[PDB]
Design a protein around this motif. Sequence first.
Motif, PDB file in Angstrom:
ATOM      1  N   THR A   1       0.826  -1.202   0.000  1.00 29.59           N
ATOM      2  CA  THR A   1       0.000   0.000   0.000  1.00 29.59           C
ATOM      3  C   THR A   1       0.862   1.255   0.000  1.00 29.59           C
TER       4      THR A   1
ATOM      5  N   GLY B   1      -6.440   6.339   3.701  1.00 28.92           N
ATOM      6  CA  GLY B   1      -7.281   5.241   3.273  1.00 28.92           C
ATOM      7  C   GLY B   1      -7.921   4.535   4.454  1.00 28.92           C
TER       8      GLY B   1
ATOM      9  N   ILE C   1       0.865   4.196  -2.853  1.00 23.70           N
ATOM     10  CA  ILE C   1       0.615   5.610  -2.583  1.00 23.70           C
ATOM     11  C   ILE C   1       1.753   6.464  -3.127  1.00 23.70           C
TER      12      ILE C   1
ATOM     13  N   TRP D   1      -8.208  12.148   1.588  1.00 23.81           N
ATOM     14  CA  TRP D   1      -8.306  12.218   3.044  1.00 23.81           C
ATOM     15  C   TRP D   1      -7.019  12.813   3.608  1.00 23.81           C
TER      16      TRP D   1
ATOM     17  N   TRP E   1      -8.661   4.655   9.853  1.00 24.94           N
ATOM     18  CA  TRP E   1      -7.735   5.427   9.037  1.00 24.94           C
ATOM     19  C   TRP E   1      -6.385   4.728   8.925  1.00 24.94           C
ATOM     20  N   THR E   2      -5.854   4.685   7.705  1.00 23.00           N
ATOM     21  CA  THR E   2      -4.496   4.232   7.436  1.00 23.00           C
ATOM     22  C   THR E   2      -3.822   5.255   6.536  1.00 23.00           C
ATOM     23  N   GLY E   3      -2.662   5.745   6.960  1.00 23.09           N
ATOM     24  CA  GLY E   3      -1.970   6.768   6.204  1.00 23.09           C
ATOM     25  C   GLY E   3      -0.471   6.579   6.123  1.00 23.09           C
ATOM     26  N   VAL E   4       0.100   6.852   4.954  1.00 22.83           N
ATOM     27  CA  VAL E   4       1.545   6.823   4.765  1.00 22.83           C
ATOM     28  C   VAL E   4       2.062   8.233   5.024  1.00 22.83           C
ATOM     29  N   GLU E   5       2.712   8.429   6.170  1.00 21.54           N
ATOM     30  CA  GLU E   5       3.184   9.757   6.544  1.00 21.54           C
ATOM     31  C   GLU E   5       4.582  10.052   6.029  1.00 21.54           C
TER      32      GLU E   5
ATOM     33  N   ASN F   1       0.919   4.596  17.395  1.00 23.29           N
ATOM     34  CA  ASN F   1       0.004   4.527  16.264  1.00 23.29           C
ATOM     35  C   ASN F   1       0.708   4.257  14.943  1.00 23.29           C
ATOM     36  N   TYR F   2       1.981   3.866  14.953  1.00 21.82           N
ATOM     37  CA  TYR F   2       2.774   3.878  13.732  1.00 21.82           C
ATOM     38  C   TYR F   2       3.517   2.572  13.509  1.00 21.82           C
TER      39      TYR F   2
END
Lengths: 171, 176, 172, 53, 85, 84, 317, 319, 316
Positions: free
Chosen positions: F18, I127, F22, I145, F74-78, F44-45
């Motif tokens: 994923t 996501g 992204i 988002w 929520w899932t995010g690539v920071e 959280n990471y």
Amino acid sequence: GLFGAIAGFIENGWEGMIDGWYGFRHQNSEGTGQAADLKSTQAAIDQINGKLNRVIEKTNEKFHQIEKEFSEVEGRIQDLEKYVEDTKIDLWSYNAELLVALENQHTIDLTDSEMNKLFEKTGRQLRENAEDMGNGCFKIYHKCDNACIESIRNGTYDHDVYRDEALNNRF
Amino acid sequence: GLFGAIAGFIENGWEGMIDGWYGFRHQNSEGTGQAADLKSTQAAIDQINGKLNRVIEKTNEKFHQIEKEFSEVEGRIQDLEKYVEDTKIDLWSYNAELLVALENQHTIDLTDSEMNKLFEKTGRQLRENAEDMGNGCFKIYHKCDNACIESIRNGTYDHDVYRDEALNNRFQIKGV
Amino acid sequence: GLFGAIAGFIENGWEGMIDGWYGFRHQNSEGTGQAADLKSTQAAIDQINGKLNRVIEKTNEKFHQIEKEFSEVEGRIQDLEKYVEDTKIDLWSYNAELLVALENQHTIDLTDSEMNKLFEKTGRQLRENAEDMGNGCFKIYHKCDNACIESIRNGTYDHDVYRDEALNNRFQ
Amino acid sequence: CNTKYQQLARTAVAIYNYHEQAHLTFVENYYYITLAAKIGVVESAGWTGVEEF
Amino acid sequence: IVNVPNCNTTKYQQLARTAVAIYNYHEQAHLTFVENLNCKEQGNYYYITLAATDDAGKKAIYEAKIGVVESAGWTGVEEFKLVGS
Amino acid sequence: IVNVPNCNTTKYQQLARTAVAIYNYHEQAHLTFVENLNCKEQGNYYYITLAATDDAGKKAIYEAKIGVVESAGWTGVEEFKLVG
Amino acid sequence: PGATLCLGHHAVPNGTLVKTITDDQIEVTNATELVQSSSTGKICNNPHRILDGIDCTLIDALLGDPHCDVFQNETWDLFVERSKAFSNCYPYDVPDYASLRSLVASSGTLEFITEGFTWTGVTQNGGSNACKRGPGSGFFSRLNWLTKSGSTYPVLNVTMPNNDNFDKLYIWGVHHPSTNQEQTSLYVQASGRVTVSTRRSQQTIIPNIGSRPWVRGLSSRISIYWTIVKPGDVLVINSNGNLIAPRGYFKMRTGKSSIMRSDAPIDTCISECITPNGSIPNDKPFQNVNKITYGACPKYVKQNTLKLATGMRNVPE
Amino acid sequence: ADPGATLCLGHHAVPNGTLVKTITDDQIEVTNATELVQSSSTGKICNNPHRILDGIDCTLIDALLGDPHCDVFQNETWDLFVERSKAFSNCYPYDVPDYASLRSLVASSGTLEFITEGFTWTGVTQNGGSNACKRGPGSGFFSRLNWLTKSGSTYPVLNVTMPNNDNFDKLYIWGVHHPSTNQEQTSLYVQASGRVTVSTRRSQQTIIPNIGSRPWVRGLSSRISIYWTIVKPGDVLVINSNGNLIAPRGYFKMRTGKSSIMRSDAPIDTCISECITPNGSIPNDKPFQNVNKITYGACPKYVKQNTLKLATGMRNVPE
Amino acid sequence: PGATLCLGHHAVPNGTLVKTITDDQIEVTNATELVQSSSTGKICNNPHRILDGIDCTLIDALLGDPHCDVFQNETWDLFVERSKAFSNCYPYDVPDYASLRSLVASSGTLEFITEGFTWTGVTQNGGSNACKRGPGSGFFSRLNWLTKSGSTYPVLNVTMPNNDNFDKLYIWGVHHPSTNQEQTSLYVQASGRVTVSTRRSQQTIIPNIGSRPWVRGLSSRISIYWTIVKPGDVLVINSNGNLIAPRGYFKMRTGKSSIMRSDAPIDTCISECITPNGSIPNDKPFQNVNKITYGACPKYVKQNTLKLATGMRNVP
Ligand SMILES: *[C@@H]1O[C@H](CO)[C@@H](O[C@@H]2O[C@H](CO)[C@@H](O[C@@H]3O[C@H](CO)[C@@H](O)[C@H](O)[C@@H]3O)[C@H](O)[C@H]2NC(C)=O)[C@H](O)[C@H]1NC(C)=O
Ligand SMILES: *[C@@H]1O[C@H](CO)[C@@H](O[C@@H]2O[C@H](CO)[C@@H](O)[C@H](O)[C@H]2NC(C)=O)[C@H](O)[C@H]1NC(C)=O
Ligand SMILES: *[C@@H]1O[C@H](CO)[C@@H](O[C@@H]2O[C@H](CO)[C@@H](O)[C@H](O)[C@H]2NC(C)=O)[C@H](O)[C@H]1NC(C)=O
Ligand SMILES: *[C@@H]1O[C@H](CO)[C@@H](O[C@@H]2O[C@H](CO)[C@@H](O)[C@H](O)[C@H]2NC(C)=O)[C@H](O)[C@H]1NC(C)=O
Ligand SMILES: *[C@@H]1O[C@H](CO)[C@@H](O[C@@H]2O[C@H](CO)[C@@H](O)[C@H](O)[C@H]2NC(C)=O)[C@H](O)[C@H]1NC(C)=O
Ligand SMILES: *[C@@H]1O[C@H](CO)[C@@H](O[C@@H]2O[C@H](CO)[C@@H](O)[C@H](O)[C@H]2NC(C)=O)[C@H](O)[C@H]1NC(C)=O
Ligand SMILES: *[C@@H]1O[C@H](CO)[C@@H](O)[C@H](O)[C@H]1NC(C)=O
Ligand SMILES: *[C@@H]1O[C@H](CO)[C@@H](O)[C@H](O)[C@H]1NC(C)=O
Ligand SMILES: *[C@@H]1O[C@H](CO)[C@@H](O)[C@H](O)[C@H]1NC(C)=O
Ligand SMILES: *[C@@H]1O[C@H](CO)[C@@H](O)[C@H](O)[C@H]1NC(C)=O
Ligand SMILES: *[C@@H]1O[C@H](CO)[C@@H](O)[C@H](O)[C@H]1NC(C)=O
Ligand SMILES: *[C@@H]1O[C@H](CO)[C@@H](O)[C@H](O)[C@H]1NC(C)=O
């Protein structure tokens, strides 16, 4: 028409008759002539004028209404405002189309009827003194001078005065 | 009317005829008389009743609708609610006005037609035994007692019975 | 009808007449026969076709409109959306009902009229050579063979040719 | 100092003639003007007001 | 110097009757107010000790805590506890 | 307590794939995930070190910081930084 | 011999084609047109009182945009909005603009009655160079821009009873600053609030701080709201910041007034029916000019012509 | 010779003709006519065959909420609810955003059938009342609403859930209290600013109370705002609040059918009539009526004309 | 010894009853039906372009629900929504859902044009496992988002002018967390705010924090809003938290397109008129099938039959 006189057993109209809608043309010993019939002309004119005055009677006065043109897209409420006005216009457009079609069919028939009524009324005056030639004309089987023709056109012709002369010529 | 009988070659109506809409008056050897015609009266009555029943047929039942009176100024939505109801009322008011005008014109014409039909049917019975006087009356050129008038009104009049007598009276001319 | 011919002084119709709407049946010295009249048939057919084409004329094309079915109760705006569509349907249903009733009354009357016109036209051809029997038939008071009957149906019958013969039979 | 500054002063005198229903006539974050006959400006809001007179 | 309220006033009797009615409504009971025993006003709160009988005719003593916030027109029974017989 | 994690478990490979997708979307690149090298959870990471090749087959090593807030789904690539 | 008598009917050389139940086109001697399909292009000034907005929308004249000052206390039967209209004051929007435009247009008047509102603790009559009245700064003539006085913006709690026998229309507003310091510089408090209420209704607006597009120098906005106070009721305004206060009320009336969008010029004639294309005669029962009309008007239909026969069938020789 | 005979055809006539309109004539005399426009009413509303519910002093909304003087309308049903102009509210001052829609959907539902549900309000004081809403000689409140306030010195975050396991729709009526002062706010709800969030799987509503002075209504400057939520079968009601919640005690059962509401001051009488108007009941033998554009039942269609005579006889030609 | 000549008219043994002004039923020789009351039950795919939504509502295809990816950049004259459709992405709602569904349906296209928005200081492309695209997490294809980057969420303030000659439709959203911890974890600020404006309009949305019923494992929600930017105007988006950002605009059109709910199968045939029951011929002027129609259709009436006399009175 429904009665078969105008555009029927009467072959065509008279462009030369400019003082009435229906009338008589005659041929006798003193020559030919033409005279409009007032009662039948006025009956057709009165019916058409009455129908016309009812149709053009000013009866619609509206002031503040709904908006009918829009410069921005809004969705639901504007969809309904447009649908209401479009529905109204189509219903009034239908009313107007049917009205003139019904009125015109009736106008052609009532004027046809007045022609046939005048023909039948004239044949009833002549009784056994004349025969229907089938083309809107009566063959009158007795001498009929101008005063005699005038008595038919003003409805005072007494058929019994000429009956003996007419029955003899016919048979 | 379209046919020229009622308010036409028949000069006026008979207030004394209270048992029918159309009928006969006669003068013969036994006197004068009056009789209503049943078939022509019933034909006019049936057509008007059929027309009337179609007009008054209960066909409208509504329950929860929109509001039509308002106590506060609101603008857009109330403008549309009032406009919708005003549009409906005007279209139904037009329909109701047009309906009675067409129906009444046709009722006058159909009752005129029934009078003309009865007159023409009577003249066809009499054939060469009578002449049309031009005012809705037939001059009958033979002796015709009450039984003879009755046979005309009930449609059994045999014209051949009187034809010789009638033709003789009709074609009397002046001799020199 | 208003004119008294069809379902009137003409007692009934002819199922055997399959080539026209109006016509003649005759009996003379050569036998009996039947023939349809073309003009009166075509005049009635033209009026009904013109009326029919006027009614079925495609004149309605709509695209995006309002919604008319609803899955949730909303109140005011949905009440108006339903009332607008209900009002429209009732007004068009009335129009459709009145239209067919007026058209059918007129179609019955115009076809009655065409029968009466053909009858009046035929009696005017015959003049004093025939009498109206009151049931749609003319009694013709002279010898009238097939060629003579045809001359009546195609409009060339000259009444003066037979008048002397016909008057003699009629009145003596 | 009698420029901009003149329009600010007459604006203050006109607002006074409105608020107090008087009829003066001009002779000659905040602006402090002494005139003959206290103004704030916030340029991001486009506001101009006479806090005191 | 100290001002002591009259517990048999219209205001205090109505506060107790209301307290009994709220208890009856919340607990599906049928107590009937008899009389107030002691009463106290402190801030937005009234503290009333009352006697009430049940349908069996037995009298018992209850302690009610009633709040009143005038600007809201609010009256609320916060406590209604049986103390004894 | 020493833990030697399997950084190529189904969960960890999907978190890395994923992240690669992204990055390719945001930078208009076309890296292809190969394998995870190291992996670590902290709060959280997820902190993942992965290998990815380009269209020429050039392998490089990247460090990704991936956040998860489960209550929000929520899932995010920071972070996705090239290391070499 | 004898004589010949022929019955007949007239005919003309130039017939007219009409529609019937059975025939699509059939020739009669005469007909009259039933659909008004033309206009002069001009709006007649009699008998309806016309009011040309020229450069001003009805809302801009309502609020008191300085270039719309000429419309103060004006009345109309028909307000005409030109497509060239523009705003030249503080940038604003009106939630439910169409309804406010509609109800004011239907009232037919802008009669304004100044009322003695008391605003203790705030400074009044704020203006802007985006809304010039003359050379200097200005504001909407009917609105009062309230900001902090000294170092505080107190809670405003004013009342205004309606002891008259008519409805009062109050126009007020809410200021949306573009930054947090802009909010605190004008109204001290971090978040403002406007609550306008009667005994029937309450409306509470919270301002929205943030950047909007640059319009006449400003990134801020004003939102316009309205409240009607019926006879015997009372108005109450409550705010701790951002209130664009009213100076009074507009007298409300009922009647035949309305508003129309048109670019047709006004002319010196008499006509009962008005359309955006211009005035049209109303001797015909139907018209095809515009579905938008005002006055005693023919009903709009889709057909551009409907001939009503006024004579018999025309059969020339 | 003989005179022969005369046979005259004729038609009848009357001395009392009636004028009617036609296509060509504005007025023409025929022998008989019948009126097609119903233009009169007895002025009374017939109580059969429709179920009429007379609101008397109560609007439908006030009977729904449970205003004490409207207690008699609890669990009532109707085909037509009649609202009188003398109606008045006598409880806590309130307002209903989209009042018209709520009045419409309840009127169309035709019932006030209420079903109490076992809500659990942990940590709050229930059953708040008011001297502006007396039931009996003492303070009271809307019978279908539950005024929640602090217990002790805290007002917790309420988080209650009520699923709909039935096969019909549930109507929940609830409210939000708007205090007049900050002291009033914290005295009742501890938190300086409340919040009411009512949600289902398909929708959510969040209301923030407003603190400020409104005009006095029955001695009070505060308000309650009424809202509603419909829960479909299989969905679930969630109520979330940390202050100012005026809680429901249950749901109103929802129905579809022919019910409605009407404003009228006409008295109700013991008679039979299918058609009802604000002016009273009218017969429905005629296809049109001029009494009122507001009607209920099997009614003639409203038209502008006060008379439309349909000819039922021939032309009247007196002697 | 003479001749007899009889006038007559024809008759049939199979007359038809019709209504008139005077008679409820009277027999004529021939009649034609004026009310279309039957349907094949199928929707013809010509001459109108029919787009079958299958499992997807129009809104879900607009937002970009992953199982609705196939509808990207689609066009239609009639969009057909099936009752079996379902959402399978982040739980959301649309205030004025009916209006947005209407204006997009009337536009007739989902043509999307990606624009170069710059979101400085935030994490993009968030996501969710409640919105899988493939085996991994995903999101609405047309939405973006945004969450915190590092430990901050700055005040976003981007601008997008419209220099084209058509209207732009922007779809955007606001995230409603379930807890305060969720709010600060994603957006740092304890209370978010989304302000979307043009020169002609402005919208500001304040998120709502609270517990909702679970939908696909989540108690949080996204609220969808929309903004139209006219040619010459400019889009400004301002937010300090909870913004679900647009990735671009949908091209807007005017025309004859619409949307219809139907479970009727689609077939390869020709029919100008469409109803939820299927296509119907339009030779008759009236129809009794459905008040919902699209195209050149007979007008809906309540009667299931209306016979128009096409012959004389039948007197056998
Ligand atoms: C904000 O201003 C309003 C209006 O000035 C204030 O409301 C007014 O409050 C007074 C006393 O609080 C009320 O007076 C009372 O009237 C009743 C009935 O007439 C009378 O029986 C009492 O003895 C008392 O005189 C007045 O009616 C009321 N008016 C309105 C329109 O609400 C309000 O109090 C102010 N806000 C604050 C926080 O003070
Ligand atoms: C009807 O026409 C007859 C025929 O012309 C009229 O009789 C003549 O009337 C004129 C009067 O202008 C007299 O000079 C003639 O002597 C009359 N001739 C006969 C033979 O009588 C009659 O007057 C007309 N009647 C009406 C009412 O117009
Ligand atoms: C937010 O962004 C807008 C648009 O990018 C900025 O508005 C511009 O501001 C400058 C001066 O500050 C003007 O010269 C431009 O004309 C404005 N453009 C538009 C489209 O409005 C705005 O300044 C930004 N706000 C902040 C606080 O940075
Ligand atoms: C019955 O009526 C139908 C239609 O009303 C007649 O059929 C029509 O005939 C015309 C003749 O020009 C054609 O143009 C139409 O296409 C025909 N329509 C249909 C549906 O066939 C029919 O001839 C009449 N007679 C019978 C026995 O059906
Ligand atoms: C508020 O109440 C709701 C009830 O709807 C709680 O939601 C439930 O949460 C558990 C786990 O926490 C899930 O297993 C259930 O499926 C949820 N129920 C529904 C109907 O979705 C929610 O957790 C509560 N929140 C708080 C803060 O107490
Ligand atoms: C066309 O479809 C509609 C609805 O899909 C049908 O109308 C439904 O008919 C059933 C049974 O008669 C009723 O239970 C529903 O209440 C009706 N719905 C509506 C909205 O009226 C209609 O019968 C179908 N017609 C044809 C010809 O297939
Ligand atoms: C007709 O009248 C005559 C004379 O009164 C009578 O003899 C005959 O029976 C009648 N026939 C019918 C059918 O009424
Ligand atoms: C009419 O019929 C007669 C009889 O057969 C025939 O001789 C004649 O040619 C026909 N004329 C026309 C014009 O049809
Ligand atoms: C014919 O129509 C014209 C125009 O509608 C009208 O002016 C005239 O009066 C009508 N009658 C005659 C006899 O021209
Ligand atoms: C009236 O104006 C409209 C546009 O507003 C135009 O479409 C229409 O054709 C015009 N009609 C006439 C008769 O000028
Ligand atoms: C005339 O019509 C009226 C209805 O208005 C009816 O009451 C009356 O009986 C009728 N009279 C006749 C003689 O038909
Ligand atoms: C019915 O009531 C309305 C409203 O009060 C009134 O305007 C109307 O005249 C009344 N009509 C009748 C027939 O009572």
